[PDB]
C-alpha cells in the first residue's frame, strides 16, 4: 500500500523493538525492590483551613514559591489570591472569560496566569504602580482550549492546549518561541522538572511525552494507560513522574527506565483521577478522584495510606506547597481546603 | 493582630463584600450551553456569547465554536448550566443519526446527567419541503419509519400535510426515546419545532427553563 503499508510496518517493528528493550531492562519490579521497607502506615491529614470565597466550582489552584500565597480559578470568572495562613483574600481578579480551566503562580511571585476555553493565556501583573491587578500580556496563538500553563521564569511560560500541542512562549514579545507537537489528543496537563530544562505532558491519547524545552523535541514517549491522562506531576528528584488517568489508575514512569514502575489502583476504585501531586520526599502521592475523595498513595508500596475525605463534589485540583507543609485541594463545591 | 494585619483583614472583608455583590449578580443569571452541528443553524438561535433578557430574567447563552471535534473534556465545564440547548437539522437525514448519537452521549454523560436539554428541531421548513418532494425517504436511513404512526398527542399545524407531521414527529420521537430510555427523572428533554424565521425561541427558552427549575425545586423539596 506504498506509504500506508511501509511506514505502518516500520513503525510496528520499531514499537516491537521498544517493547523488547523495555522487557530486557525490566530487571525487577519496584514493588519487590521495596517489598522489605517499613509500611508508611496511615497519614491522617485533617482539614486545617477552608477558604470560601469562590462563587462556583473551582477548576485549578497553584501555590506560590513562598508556600503561603496561592491562586485559584473558578467558574464565576474570578481569580482569587489567598493568604493560606490567615484565610485573607489578598486579591480578587475579575476575568473576561468565565471558563478558565487553569491558573499559574509565577515562581518570582510578580505575575499570575490564567486561561481556558478562550484559547488565550492571560498574564496579570500583581506588583504594579497603579495598585490594582492589571492584565499585562494576552498570549494568543493556540487553536484549542488551554488545559494547563506553567511559568518557566518571569518572561517565559509553558502552556498546554487542547489543540494537541504544547507551546513555550515569551511574554515580552508575546510570540511562541517553540511549539511542541506529537500528541494525538488534547494535552490535559504539564509538569515542569525541578531543573526546568524539560517537562512532561499528559494527553488524551493515553500517553505522556517528555519534551526538551531548548531543542523543542520529544525525548521520550511513555505508554501504559488505556484512558485519557488528566493529571501529571514530576517526581521531586526530577528523574520520574506520575500520571493520573480516567482508567482510575495512577502510574509512575521513570525517565531513565522509560517504562511504568508501579500502578496505583484498586479493584473497587472505578473513578478517574483529576489531579495528582507528590510530597517533598516523593513518598506520598496524593491523587484527587471523581468520587469526591482524595487518596494518599504510598509511592513506593502502592498501598493506599490515607484518604483526604471532606469535599462534597469532584476534587478538581490538588497541589503541595514547595516547603511541603500543607496540601491544598480545590473541588467543585466552591471551597479550597488546606490539609496538614 | 498588628495594625497592618487588621488592615489586611479589613481589605479581605471588603473583597468579600464585592464577592457578595457579584454573587447577587451571578445567581440571577441563567447559563445555557448551545450545541449543534455545523449545518444545524444554531448560529441564528471562538466562543460566541449571547446575553438576552426575557421578563426581567437574565439568560447567558454560550456557543463554543473555537475547539476541535473532540468534546469529551471541555464539555464537563458546563456541569452546572441551567439547561443544554441542542440544535439539530431535521432536513438532513444523513446526519440525523450523528445528532442522535451526540444527544445520547450528552444524556448519558456522567457529568451532564443532571442537565436538562432543550431540543430545537431547526430546519422544519426544509424538512417539510424535502418530505413533500421525492428527494429522499426517511425509511432509507430509518427502516422503523415504516411501522410508525403519528402520536395521538401530536398537534399538526393548520394547512400542513399529515406526512410532514409523521416525519417531524418521528424525528422528535427518536430523540424522545433516547431521552426517556434513562435518566429516571433527574433531567428532562424539551422538544421544540423551530424555523429559521421564528422569533419566539427566547420565550420558549424562558418557559422551558422555568419548568426545569420548578421541577428542580420540587425535587429538592421532596415534592417530586
Amino acid at each position, epitope marked *: 500500500q506504498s506509504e500506508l503499508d511501509q511506514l505502518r510496518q516500520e513503525a510496528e517493528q520499531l514499537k516491537n523493538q521498544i517493547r523488547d528493550a523495555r522487557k530486557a531492562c525490566a530487571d525487577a519490579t519496584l514493588s519487590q525492590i521495596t517489598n522489605n521497607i517499613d509500611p508508611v502506615g496511615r497519614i491522617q491529614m485533617r482539614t486545617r483551613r477552608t477558604l470560601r470565597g469562590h462563587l462556583a466550582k473551582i477548576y485549578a489552584m497553584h501555590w506560590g514559591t513562598d508556600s503561603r500565597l496561592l491562586v485559584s480559578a473558578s467558574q464565576d470568572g474570578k481569580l482569587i489570591i489567598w493568604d493560606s495562613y490567615t484565610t485573607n483574600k489578598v486579591h480578587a481578579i475579575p476575568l473576561r472569560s468565565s471558563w478558565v480551566m487553569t491558573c499559574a503562580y509565577a515562581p518570582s511571585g510578580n505575575y499570575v496566569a490564567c486561561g481556558g476555553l478562550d484559547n488565550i493565556c492571560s498574564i496579570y501583573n500583581l506588583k504594579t504602580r497603579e495598585g490594582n491587578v492589571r492584565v499585562s500580556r494576552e498570549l494568543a496563538g493556540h487553536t484549542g482550549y488551554l488545559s494547563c500553563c506553567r511559568f518557566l521564569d518571569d518572561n517565559q511560560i509553558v502552556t498546554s492546549s487542547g489543540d494537541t500541542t504544547c507551546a513555550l512562549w515569551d511574554i515580552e514579545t508575546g510570540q511562541q518561541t517553540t511549539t511542541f507537537t506529537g500528541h494525538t489528543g488534547d494535552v490535559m496537563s504539564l509538569s515542569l522538572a525541578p531543573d526546568t530544562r524539560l517537562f512532561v505532558s499528559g494527553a488524551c491519547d493515553a500517553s505522556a511525552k517528555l519534551w526538551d524545552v531548548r531543542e523543542g523535541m520529544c525525548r521520550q514517549t511513555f505508554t501504559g494507560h488505556e484512558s485519557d491522562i488528566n493529571a501529571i506531576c514530576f517526581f521531586p528528584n526530577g528523574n520520574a513522574f506520575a500520571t493520573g488517568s480516567d482508567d482510575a489508575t495512577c502510574r509512575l514512569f521513570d525517565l531513565r527506565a522509560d517504562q511504568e514502575l508501579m500502578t496505583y489502583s484498586h479493584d473497587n476504585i472505578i473513578c478517574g483521577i483529576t489531579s495528582v501531586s507528590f510530597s517533598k520526599s516523593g513518598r506520598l502521592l496524593l491523587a484527587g478522584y471523581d468520587d469526591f475523595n482524595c487518596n494518599v498513595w504510598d509511592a513506593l508500596k502502592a498501598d493506599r495510606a490515607g484518604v483526604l475525605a471532606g469535599h462534597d463534589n469532584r476534587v478538581s485540583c490538588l497541589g503541595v506547597t514547595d516547603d511541603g507543609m500543607a496540601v491544598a485541594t480545590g473541588s467543585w463545591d466552591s471551597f479550597l481546603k488546606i490539609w496538614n | 493582630l498588628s495594625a497592618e494585619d487588621k488592615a489586611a483583614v479589613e481589605r479581605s472583608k471588603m473583597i468579600e463584600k464585592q464577592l457578595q455583590k457579584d454573587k447577587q449578580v451571578y445567581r440571577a443569571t441563567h447559563r445555557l450551553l448551545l450545541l449543534g452541528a455545523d449545518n444545524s443553524g444554531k448560529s441564528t438561535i471562538g466562543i460566541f456569547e449571547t446575553k438576552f433578557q426575557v421578563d426581567k430574567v437574565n439568560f447567558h447563552m454560550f456557543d463554543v465554536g473555537g475547539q476541535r471535534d*473532540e468534546r469529551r473534556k471541555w464539555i464537563q465545564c458546563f456541569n452546572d448550566v441551567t439547561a443544554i440547548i441542542f440544535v439539530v437539522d431535521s432536513s438532513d437525514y444523513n446526519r440525523l443519526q450523528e445528532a442522535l448519537n451526540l444527544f445520547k452521549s450528552i444524556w448519558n454523560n456522567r457529568w451532564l446527567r443532571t442537565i436538562s436539554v432543550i431540543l430545537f428541531l431547526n430546519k422544519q421548513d426544509l424538512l417539510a419541503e424535502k418530505v413533500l418532494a421525492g428527494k429522499s425517504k426517511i425509511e432509507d436511513y430509518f427502516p422503523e419509519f415504516a411501522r410508525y404512526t403519528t402520536p395521538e398527542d401530536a398537534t399538526p399545524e393548520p394547512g400542513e400535510d399529515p406526512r410532514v407531521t409523521r416525519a417531524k414527529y418521528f424525528i422528535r420521537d427518536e430523540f424522545l426515546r433516547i431521552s426517556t430510555a434513562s435518566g429516571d427523572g433527574r433531567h428532562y428533554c424539551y422538544p421544540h419545532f423551530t424555523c429559521a424565521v421564528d422569533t419566539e425561541n427566547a420565550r420558549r427558552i424562558f418557559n422551558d427553563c422555568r419548568d426545569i427549575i420548578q421541577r428542580m425545586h420540587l425535587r429538592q423539596y421532596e415534592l417530586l
Partner: nanobody, 128 residues
Framework: QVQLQESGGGLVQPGGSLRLSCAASGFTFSNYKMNWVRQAPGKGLEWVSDISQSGASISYTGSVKGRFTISRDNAKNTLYLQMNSLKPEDTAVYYC?????????????????????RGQGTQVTVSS
C-alpha cells in the same frame, strides 16, 4: 499501549457475506463499550454499531440495520462485525472504535477525525 488491530476486509461481490474482526490489546476489554465506524470514500467518519460492556445493549444505524450484526467476545478480547447482503453503498474502510472511558455508556468523540483509540482500518469494498 492501546492497540486496536482489525482485519477481515476484502473484495466481495454485492449481496455476499463478510466477517470483520478487531483484536484489541493494551486494555481491559470487558469494561469498555466497543464501536464500529466506517469512512466511505469522499465522505467523513460515521458510526455504524455499538455493543455494551457485557453485550446486552446493541444498536446499529438504520442503513445497516438487519444485515449487520456486532458481537464481542471478552474472553479473547476481540470485537466482531458479521455483515450480510453487502451493497455498493457499503464500500468503506472500517475502523474499530472504543469508548474513551471505562464503565460508561457515552462513547464521546468516537467518530472524530483524529481519535486516539481507533484502529487503522480494513478496506471493505463491494462491487461487481
Amino acid at each position: 499501549q492501546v492497540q486496536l488491530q482489525e482485519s477481515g476486509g476484502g473484495l466481495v461481490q454485492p449481496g455476499g457475506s463478510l466477517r470483520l474482526s478487531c483484536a484489541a490489546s493494551g486494555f481491559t476489554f470487558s469494561n469498555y463499550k466497543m464501536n464500529w465506524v466506517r469512512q466511505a470514500p469522499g465522505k467523513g467518519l460515521e458510526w455504524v454499531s455499538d455493543i455494551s460492556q457485557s453485550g446486552a445493549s446493541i444498536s446499529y444505524t438504520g442503513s445497516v440495520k438487519g444485515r449487520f450484526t456486532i458481537s464481542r467476545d471478552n474472553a479473547k478480547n476481540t470485537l466482531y462485525l458479521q455483515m450480510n447482503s453487502l451493497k455498493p453503498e457499503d464500500t468503506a474502510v472500517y475502523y474499530c472504535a472504543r469508548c474513551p472511558a471505562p464503565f460508561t455508556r457515552d462513547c464521546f468523540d468516537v467518530t472524530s477525525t483524529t481519535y486516539a483509540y481507533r484502529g487503522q482500518g480494513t478496506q471493505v469494498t463491494v462491487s461487481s
